[PDB]
C-alpha cells in the first residue's frame, strides 16, 4: 500500500457526515478554504466529483481552482473519492 | 408512501444506472436530463449532494432542469434521500 492513512480510513467505510478534512490530500489549509467556499462536508465534495462525472482532469482542476490544491493533493483527493465510489456507490 | 421503482433503487448501490432508474424520472424527463449532461443516476445524486440534500433547492433544480412536476420531483428527491440514508 502506498496510500495515506487518511485514504485507507476514508475508503473503508461509508462517509456519512465526515468533514471535508477526512479526504485524502485535504489538510487543514485546503480544508479551511473548501469550507469557506461552502464545501463543508466530504459528501459535498463527493457531490462535485459526481456532477463532474468522476472525470479526473475536471475534478482535480476544480480542486486547484477552488482551494489551490497542488498536483499531489488533488491526485490524492481524487483517488480517495474514486476508490470510495468503486466500493460504495 | 412509495412506488416499487423507489424501493428497487433504494435497496442497492446505484452503480452505473441510467437516470431513468430514479423514481419519478420517466422517459420524457430522462431524455431532458440526458441532454443536459445528466445521463447516469449518480450525476443527479451529485447535484443532490452539491445542494446539501436540500429538498426545496433540489426539487426546484429538477423542475428548472427537466420540467419535472411537483410529484415527479417529490419522488426523485425521496428516492435519493433514502438511498443516502442507506449507503452514504
Which CATH number fits the domain that encloses residue A10?
A: 1.10.150.40
Closest Cα in chain A, distance from residue B52 (Å): 6
For A14-68, give the DSSP string.
Answer: --TT--GGGSTT--HHHHHHHHHTT--SHHHHHHHHHHTTT-HHHHHHHHHHHH-
- The answer to whether the CB atoms of B88 and A51 lie below 8 A apart is no
Domain with B16, as residue range(s), is 1-88
Measured on CA atoms in the order B75, A40, A89, A53, is the torsion positive or negative?
positive
How far apart, in whole angstroms, are the C-alpha atoms of residue B50 and residue A79?
A: 19
In chain B, which residues have their Cβ closer than 8 Å to the Cβ of A46? 46, 49
Closest Cα in chain A, distance from residue B63 (Å): 17
- Phi first, then psi: give them for residue A68, nearest 5 degrees: 60, 35
Count Cβ atoms within 10 A of the Cβ of residue A69 and give its class: 0-12 exposed, 13-18 middle, 19 or more buried. buried
Residue pair B40/B76 in contact by the 8 Å Cβ criterion: no
Minimum-distance CB partner of B49 among A16, A47, A52: A47
Nearest to A16 by CA among B42, B49, B55: B49
Name the domain count of chain A: 1
Supply A43's cell numbers: 459528501
Residue pair A11/A83 in contact by the 8 Å Cβ criterion: yes
Question: Which residue bears the cell 482542476?
Answer: A61
Q: Using alpha carbons, list the distances in angstroms from residue A78 to A37, A39, A42, A72, B68.
A: 19, 15, 12, 10, 32
Overall size of chain B counted in residues: 88
Nearest to B38 by CA among B74, B62, B54, B55: B62
Residue pair B47/B58 in contact by the 8 Å Cβ criterion: yes
Amino acid at each position: 500500500m502506498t496510500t495515506s492513512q487518511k485514504h485507507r480510513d476514508f475508503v473503508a467505510e461509508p462517509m456519512g457526515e465526515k468533514p471535508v478534512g477526512s479526504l485524502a490530500g485535504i489538510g487543514e489549509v485546503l480544508g479551511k478554504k473548501l469550507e469557506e467556499r461552502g464545501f463543508d462536508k466530504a459528501y459535498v465534495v463527493l457531490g462535485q466529483f459526481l456532477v463532474l462525472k468522476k472525470d479526473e482532469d475536471l475534478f482535480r482542476e476544480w480542486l486547484k481552482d477552488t482551494c489551490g490544491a497542488n498536483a499531489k493533493q488533488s491526485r490524492d483527493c481524487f483517488g480517495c473519492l474514486r476508490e470510495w465510489c468503486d466500493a460504495f456507490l
